Write an enzyme that holds these catalytic residues in place. Structure first.
Site, PDB file in Angstrom:
ATOM      1  N   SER A 102      80.423  12.444 -24.490  1.00  0.00           N
ATOM      2  CA  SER A 102      80.414  13.284 -25.676  1.00  0.00           C
ATOM      3  C   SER A 102      80.715  12.379 -26.868  1.00  0.00           C
ATOM      4  O   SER A 102      80.232  12.611 -27.975  1.00  0.00           O
ATOM      5  CB  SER A 102      81.461  14.401 -25.553  1.00  0.00           C
ATOM      6  N   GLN A 159      73.574 -12.024  -3.626  1.00  0.00           N
ATOM      7  CA  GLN A 159      74.279 -11.009  -2.860  1.00  0.00           C
ATOM      8  C   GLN A 159      73.363  -9.834  -2.530  1.00  0.00           C
ATOM      9  O   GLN A 159      73.525  -9.178  -1.507  1.00  0.00           O
ATOM     10  CB  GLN A 159      75.524 -10.549  -3.627  1.00  0.00           C
ATOM     11  N   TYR A 177      78.938  -9.650   3.760  1.00  0.00           N
ATOM     12  CA  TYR A 177      77.557  -9.183   3.861  1.00  0.00           C
ATOM     13  C   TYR A 177      76.832  -9.938   4.980  1.00  0.00           C
ATOM     14  O   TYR A 177      75.614  -9.853   5.105  1.00  0.00           O
ATOM     15  CB  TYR A 177      76.808  -9.405   2.536  1.00  0.00           C
ATOM     16  N   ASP A 221      62.936   9.763 -24.934  1.00  0.00           N
ATOM     17  CA  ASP A 221      62.236   9.269 -26.113  1.00  0.00           C
ATOM     18  C   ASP A 221      62.393   7.758 -26.258  1.00  0.00           C
ATOM     19  O   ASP A 221      61.535   7.083 -26.843  1.00  0.00           O
ATOM     20  CB  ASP A 221      62.765   9.985 -27.360  1.00  0.00           C
ATOM     21  N   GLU A 277      67.788  -9.083 -24.871  1.00  0.00           N
ATOM     22  CA  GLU A 277      68.272 -10.404 -24.490  1.00  0.00           C
ATOM     23  C   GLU A 277      69.411 -10.877 -25.375  1.00  0.00           C
ATOM     24  O   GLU A 277      69.632 -10.349 -26.465  1.00  0.00           O
ATOM     25  CB  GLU A 277      67.172 -11.447 -24.634  1.00  0.00           C
ATOM     26  N   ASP A 306      64.065 -16.250 -25.320  1.00  0.00           N
ATOM     27  CA  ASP A 306      62.770 -16.757 -24.873  1.00  0.00           C
ATOM     28  C   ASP A 306      61.827 -15.598 -24.568  1.00  0.00           C
ATOM     29  O   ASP A 306      60.620 -15.698 -24.778  1.00  0.00           O
ATOM     30  CB  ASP A 306      62.941 -17.607 -23.618  1.00  0.00           C
ATOM     31  N   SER A 313      72.809  -2.297 -15.840  1.00  0.00           N
ATOM     32  CA  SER A 313      72.342  -3.161 -14.763  1.00  0.00           C
ATOM     33  C   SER A 313      73.321  -3.603 -13.673  1.00  0.00           C
ATOM     34  O   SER A 313      72.919  -3.759 -12.522  1.00  0.00           O
ATOM     35  CB  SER A 313      71.650  -4.381 -15.363  1.00  0.00           C
ATOM     36  N   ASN A 343      79.186  -6.594 -11.570  1.00  0.00           N
ATOM     37  CA  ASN A 343      79.732  -7.749 -10.872  1.00  0.00           C
ATOM     38  C   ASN A 343      80.191  -8.851 -11.808  1.00  0.00           C
ATOM     39  O   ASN A 343      79.460  -9.793 -12.111  1.00  0.00           O
ATOM     40  CB  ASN A 343      78.710  -8.308  -9.877  1.00  0.00           C
TER      41      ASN A 343
HETATM   42  C1  PLP Z   1      69.584 -10.182 -12.678  1.00  0.00           C
HETATM   43  C2  PLP Z   1      70.301  -9.308 -13.711  1.00  0.00           C
HETATM   44  C3  PLP Z   1      69.752  -9.015 -14.968  1.00  0.00           C
HETATM   45  C4  PLP Z   1      68.398  -9.541 -15.450  1.00  0.00           C
HETATM   46  O1  PLP Z   1      67.343  -8.959 -14.661  1.00  0.00           O
HETATM   47  P1  PLP Z   1      65.911  -9.647 -14.610  1.00  0.00           P
HETATM   48  O2  PLP Z   1      65.057  -8.842 -13.693  1.00  0.00           O
HETATM   49  O3  PLP Z   1      66.017 -11.105 -14.380  1.00  0.00           O
HETATM   50  O4  PLP Z   1      65.377  -9.459 -16.106  1.00  0.00           O
HETATM   51  C5  PLP Z   1      70.431  -8.231 -15.821  1.00  0.00           C
HETATM   52  N1  PLP Z   1      71.642  -7.718 -15.492  1.00  0.00           N
HETATM   53  C6  PLP Z   1      72.204  -7.979 -14.297  1.00  0.00           C
HETATM   54  C7  PLP Z   1      73.568  -7.386 -13.989  1.00  0.00           C
HETATM   55  C8  PLP Z   1      71.534  -8.780 -13.388  1.00  0.00           C
HETATM   56  O5  PLP Z   1      72.092  -9.038 -12.160  1.00  0.00           O
HETATM   57 MG    MG Z   2      66.135 -14.755 -22.276  1.00  0.00          MG
END
Ligand code: PLP
Ligand code: MG
Ligand code: PLP
Ligand code: MG
Lengths: 318, 318
Positions: free
Chosen positions: B28, B82, B114, B171, B203, B209, B303, B306
């Site tokens: 929120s 991993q 693992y 969106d 990025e 890049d 993403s 870790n």
């Molecule tokens: C590997 C990774 C990325 C980047 O992903 P790509 O497919 O290389 O663009 C971003 N965040 C985390 C936590 C990652 O492990």
């Molecule tokens: Mg880059």
């Protein structure tokens, strides 16, 4: 006098419009170590960061017209203060919050963000209760107990209600214990959904007044205990909460701060979630007896995640 | 040559038995500041702690019989290692993991947990590729690219697929960008579920890049960038990933480490979740343009979570 499961049911209805039906997380890592199925009810993901939002909203949603217009006042140093502040804002009720001059900046900012009117006092003098009485009586403000109140405890119980409705029957349920609002509300829910579910309350070993009360059959008072579980430093259980706990809780367990810290670290490193020390009481106890939880379905109530960042970083580095 | 949404769809089917249909969180607090609706896909809650589990499993689930028996090998210093280790264990495939002698103890322990067979090298010499080639060719081990592979990218795309299936049309979609596996897989999913959804890759400004490649229409190589986004220090995009990104991504944005840190702190203090620096790229960018996201429904891909605890505590204290 005592609330029943029906009050937890009605509370679910009252808060549905504003509370979070927090997610239930699971861990393959945990299931492996326990040789069972563990389900974590994440109240750290609840509005304002703790389960208390539930009880605060349930109680404020039932004040009379005069009280709604006059407003509420809190002086608790824990999550109840912010639970009340946010609940009051949502319901259009003025809220005054008494806080120490050295209260964590982020907490003060959060409270103000919740529309709360901050009133400060000197921590060394600790004039809190005196001030709360003076201000509340003069301005006709209402003070809601952080746990010893029928509406508050019934509301706290909706977290467990949601857990059972989502995952079904459970063989064991672990719940954090301070004044007993969460535990009593959870016990009401557990007895209804799973008559055979073992319900356990958990306190910091340094503050096992709840455990002593459970043993004695009478409420036991103790001096403020020294422990990192800042939300469970209660000196005694509530009358309403103990009355229910004594009848519907199977046992009260205790864990050390060392265990709380390992749990806090585990939540961060393995489950990727932020949990305040007091919110680690339930899982710490479960781990302490993982051998007796064989192939059962176990519920863990993560009570909150409101821990000062600096403090959190400190524990993570231990 | 290029995978399409259909490959993401088939990947969902292949991983369904082992991957986590991670929860979608909302705030929120965030909705207020954005004047919109934001949805966070929590891959930090994915098996092993990052989205990479998806692509690793999708790729290993399709190796031939000989490769399954011989095993796989990884040398990446990031989450892919991993992801491969856990995926291999689940599928009954041997996995050898090359790690630096000074690799974080918790990471080494996790990898061994693992079932991965750890092989170490000296960080100062950085003999990784040389060793990986020597060992893999001699033992017939298979090396799966961390991003530049049809099976890997299609699998990474299932996170976005799940997000759209749960919350519906969006969106705008923000996704972290390293080699481009996540972004390309996500773009495939986004174009299918929401043709009009703006897709953004993000990025670290020191390593743009991907942004340069997007502008140039050709893959641009750069020296390893200095940034706290350890999972986005890629020197160049993949061929498969860029081919898709160039056609299905609307733009590539960049954020500073300072912004990543504020985001990491926000996730901890306001949402109670642990997110590694690289996993903060997507939300940091969204905040940077919250004014252009008016009343939209926005998706944020978290993403991973870790991050070495000590490192996490460090950033939290900044
Ligand atoms: C590997 C990774 C990325 C980047 O992903 P790509 O497919 O290389 O663009 C971003 N965040 C985390 C936590 C990652 O492990
Ligand atoms: Mg880059
Ligand atoms: C208030 C609180 C408790 C204790 O709850 P009671 O109802 O007093 O037993 C436990 N954990 C957290 C995070 C709390 O805020
Ligand atoms: Mg106690």
């Amino acid at each position: 006098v005592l609330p029943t499961y029906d009050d937890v049911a009605s509370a679910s209805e009252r808060i549905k419009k504003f509370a979070n039906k927090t997610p239930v997380l699971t861990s393959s890592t945990v299931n492996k170590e326990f040789v069972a199925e563990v389900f974590f009810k994440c109240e750290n993901f609840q509005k304002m960061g703790a389960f208390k939002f539930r009880g605060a909203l349930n109680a404020l949603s039932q004040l009379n017209e005069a009280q709604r217009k006059a407003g509420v006042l809190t002086f608790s140093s824990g999550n109840h203060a912010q639970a009340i502040a946010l609940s009051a804002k949502i319901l259009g009720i003025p809220a005054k919050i008494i806080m120490p001059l050295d209260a964590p900046e982020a907490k003060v900012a959060a409270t103000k963000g919740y529309g709360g009117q901050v009133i400060m006092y000197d921590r060394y003098k600790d004039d809190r209760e005196k001030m709360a009485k003076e201000i509340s009586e003069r301005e006709g403000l209402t003070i809601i107990p952080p746990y010893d109140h029928p509406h508050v405890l019934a509301g706290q119980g909706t977290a467990a209600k949601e857990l059972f409705e989502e995952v079904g029957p459970l063989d064991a349920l672990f719940v954090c214990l301070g004044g007993g609002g969460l535990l009593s509300g959870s016990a009401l829910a557990a007895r209804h959904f799973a008559p055979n579910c073992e319900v356990y309350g958990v306190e910091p070993e340094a503050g096992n007044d709840g455990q002593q009360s459970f043993r004695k059959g009478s409420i036991v008072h103790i001096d403020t205990p020294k422990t990192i579980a800042d939300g469970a430093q209660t000196q005694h259980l509530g009358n309403y909460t103990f009355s229910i706990i004594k009848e519907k809780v199977d046992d009260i367990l205790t864990v050390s701060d060392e265990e709380l810290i390992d749990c806090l670290k585990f939540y961060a490193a393995r489950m990727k979630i932020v949990v305040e020390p007091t919110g680690c009481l339930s899982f710490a106890a479960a781990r302490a007896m993982k051998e007796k939880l064989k192939n059962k379905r176990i519920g863990i109530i993560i009570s909150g995640g409101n821990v000062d960042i600096e403090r959190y970083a400190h524990f993570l580095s231990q």
